[PDB]
């Protein structure tokens, strides 16, 4: 039971670390969105950055 409680605590801390790590109201780790698309050209073609949910 002690090892199980350690597993529960680490599993909850994993979500607490994943959800809170976000820059300027958006994140590439929490999985709230599939991708972010930053500018690459004067034309406006985006540099896609696929999100990788953690």
């Amino acid at each position: 039971n002690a090892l199980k409680a350690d597993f529960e605590s680490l599993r909850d801390q994993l979500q607490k670390a994943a959800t809170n790590a976000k820059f300027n109201g958006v994140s590439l780790a929490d999985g709230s969105t599939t991708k972010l698309s930053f500018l690459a050209n004067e034309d406006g073609s985006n540099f896609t950055v696929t999100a990788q949910t953690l």
Binding site: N20, A21, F23, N24
Partner: protein
């Protein structure tokens, strides 16, 4: 402690000035300004020769 200085670096990428280009442009504009003052003095001297006509 990771997230705090990570966000500090993230705002630093956005707000901080590019000092090298700023120095280059600073001495560039300073050398341009004296030539602008010389062009000002020459433009003031251009009308002066009308007196020779009379």
């Amino acid at each position: 402690g990771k997230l705090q200085d990570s966000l500090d670096a993230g705002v630093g990428n956005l707000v901080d000035a590019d000092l090298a280009k700023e120095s280059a442009k600073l001495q560039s504009l300073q050398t341009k300004q004296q030539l602008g003052v010389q062009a000002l003095s020459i433009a003031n001297q251009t009308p002066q020769t009308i007196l020779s006509l009379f």
